[PDB]
Design a protein around this nucleic acid. Structure first.
Ligand SMILES: [Mg+2]
Ligand SMILES: [Mg+2]
Length: 596
DNA sequence: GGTCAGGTCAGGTCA
């Protein structure tokens, strides 16, 4: 009942020098080259595809089509997403066994299972180890994107920042022996960095760690007035204000790093004893006061704010900022709007000067990221009407809000979707259950909420454009799933495809109708059940056009019937946006080629 | 057969 192979590197093994008796000795040639490959003869430019072809003799596959079949899996590995899998069946089905010389002696009908396991051996003992030798997998944290960087480069970057973190005395060799709680990792996040700790497993302590986090969060609801729902505060404020809205979003930089431990410790002691007893208080106090981290066989003490990667740090920083909240935001004009996520602040008022004062206040209290500041203030260098905050885009002039989409140029959109589940596996003969589990609604549910479908402050044009953008996303996921179906299910029967799509469009439109009818507003005109379906269908249409030759049947299929009459009772909807693909998603890369 | 709360999972969002 195990049908999956995981692409991730940690599954790898450490190659024996010789292959055992149950495997054919040709493997050892490969292994030989492994040592020779190991020889420090590498320069900056290597291609893993290229070096592998000089490690595994072509005589192992015999024919070029077999070799290409195998290297296309290798290429998938080299371009992999986190959690991604393939079907074990891929490793043996459709190979030309006649042309493989070392497989002729054994009778043909017992041959397939052997070949799968032999290819598994090569992938686990030579391919993955060779990838590990020159590269480190890091999760970009934008979807499941994984970028590989040269080990020499990652180590150099990690040494540079280690020394910088040493000159500023953030890190100090402890020398007094102390049990370290975890290992430091330096993770790049664009121009800046993220220094985090991976905690050594401390079994039975995560019940304890969840308990302490829970009890503090209860304290943070109970003593400090909840920030409000982000949606409701903004709703009330939009109704309040009929004039031009003014606003600012600021991003505090290293909010954990700018925590003053003495003040936090005093907040701890100041907690009432009925909420959190003195023993737990004292356990927490030397916990944040004695942060010990293991580097290259050496232990250091972190003495700058809260350490990311600590179980308590996420929740603890919120308490500090929550306390800062009351310290500095008790008096605010109730004709104004304010909301905070954790280290991001969004503030709006009808008066420009009061927004300016808020900006000066925050800069006076905190070191901020000036590049991350967005404002409609006129006196600012690069002012904008669109403020991104908490996954959404707010237009202060129009009051319209759109979903925010994190698609950098050349981002590969298949990294956004986690299509493989190792815990519940689907057999290679069952593609339909796979595709429909892929199209479960819950996954896009976070773009099917009151925020995008309300008509209280949102126009019908923007509720449509939101639904469209989301449906564009669902189309891109369909595409990735289809490409998965061709390359590992090796499906030939596309007749059953044209079915769940419309079953989903119907159900999705119905769910939309429900939400839109649930949140009618003063800007709500009239929305036809069928019009939503037409929008969804036009979204799929716009997407499917990227790979026309593969889908020309399907596009033609939906071309007839499937009503797209975009004659909505509004007399304003441009409708050009709906017809084609928004520029954000025209420039994103769907194909797959092994770069390095 | 009709609810419920409780428990688990799932793919997603935010920081
Ligand atoms: Mg966990
Ligand atoms: Mg938990």
């Amino acid at each position: 009942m195990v049908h999956y192979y995981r692409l991730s590197l940690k599954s790898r093994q450490k190659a024996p020098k010789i292959v055992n008796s149950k495997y054919n000795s040709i493997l050892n040639i490969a292994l030989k080259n492994f040592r020779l490959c190991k020889k420090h003869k590498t320069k900056k430019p290597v291609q893993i595809l290229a070096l592998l072809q000089e490690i595994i003799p072509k005589s192992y596959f015999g024919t070029t089509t077999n070799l290409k079949r195998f290297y296309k899996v290798v290429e998938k590995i080299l371009t992999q997403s986190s959690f991604e899998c393939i079907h074990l069946s891929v490793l043996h089905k459709c190979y030309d066994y006649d042309a493989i010389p070392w497989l002729q002696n054994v009778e043909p009908n017992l041959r397939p299972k052997l070949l799968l396991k032999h290819n598994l051996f090569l992938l686990d003992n030579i391919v993955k180890p060779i990838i590990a030798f020159y590269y480190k997998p890091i999760k970009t944290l934008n979807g499941h994107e994984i970028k590989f960087i040269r080990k020499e480069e990652y180590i150099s970057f990690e040494s540079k920042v280690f020394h910088k973190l040493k000159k500023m005395k953030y890190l100090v060799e402890v020398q007094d022996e102390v049990k370290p709680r975890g290992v430091l990792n330096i993770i790049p996040k664009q121009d800046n960095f993220r220094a985090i700790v991976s905690i050594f497993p401390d079994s039975a302590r995560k019940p304890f760690f969840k308990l302490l986090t829970s009890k503090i969060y209860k304290v943070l609801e109970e003593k400090y007035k909840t920030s409000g729902s982000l949606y409701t505060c903004w709703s009330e404020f939009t109704q309040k204000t009929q004039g031009q809205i003014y606003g600012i979003k600021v991003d505090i930089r290293d909010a954990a790093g700018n925590v003053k431990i003495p003040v936090l410790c005093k907040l701890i002691q100041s907690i009432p004893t009925h909420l959190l007893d003195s023993e737990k208080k004292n356990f927490i106090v030397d916990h944040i006061s004695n942060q010990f981290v293991a580097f290259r066989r050496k232990i250091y003490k972190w003495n700058h704010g809260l350490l990311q990667g600590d179980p308590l740090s996420g929740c603890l920083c919120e308490l500090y900022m929550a306390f800062m909240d009351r310290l500095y935001f008790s008096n605010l004009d109730k004709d104004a709007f304010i909301h905070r996520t954790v280290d991001d602040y969004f503030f709006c008022s009808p008066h420009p000067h009061k927004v300016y004062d808020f900006e000066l206040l925050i800069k006076g209290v905190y070191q901020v990221n000036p590049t991350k500041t967005r404002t409609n203030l006129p006196t600012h260098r690069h002012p904008q009407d669109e403020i991104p905050y908490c996954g959404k885009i707010f237009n202060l002039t129009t009051r319209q809000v759109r979903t925010l989409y994190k698609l950098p140029p050349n981002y590969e959109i298949r990294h956004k979707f986690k299509l493989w589940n190792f815990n519940n596996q689907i057999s290679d003969d069952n593609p339909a259950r796979f595709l429909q589990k892929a199209m479960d609604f819950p996954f896009i549910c976070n773009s099917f909420t009151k925020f995008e479908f309300n008509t209280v402050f949102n126009d019908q044009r923007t509720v449509f454009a939101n639904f469209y953008d989301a449906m564009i996303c669902v189309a891109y996921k369909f595409d990735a799933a289809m490409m998965a179906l061709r390359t590992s299910f090796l499906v030939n029967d596309f007749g059953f495809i044209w079915l769940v799509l419309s079953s989903t469009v119907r159900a999705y439109a119905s769910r939309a109708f429900k939400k839109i009818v649930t949140y009618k507003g003063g800007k709500y005109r009239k929305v036809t059940f069928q019009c939503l379906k037409s929008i969804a269908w036009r979204a799929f249409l716009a997407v499917l056009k990227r790979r026309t030759e593969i889908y020309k049947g399907l596009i033609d299929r939906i071309k007839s019937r499937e009503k797209l009459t975009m004659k909505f009772h509004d007399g304003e909807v441009d409708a050009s946006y709906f017809c084609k693909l928004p520029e954000k998603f025209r420039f994103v890369k769907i194909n797959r080629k092994a770069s390095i």
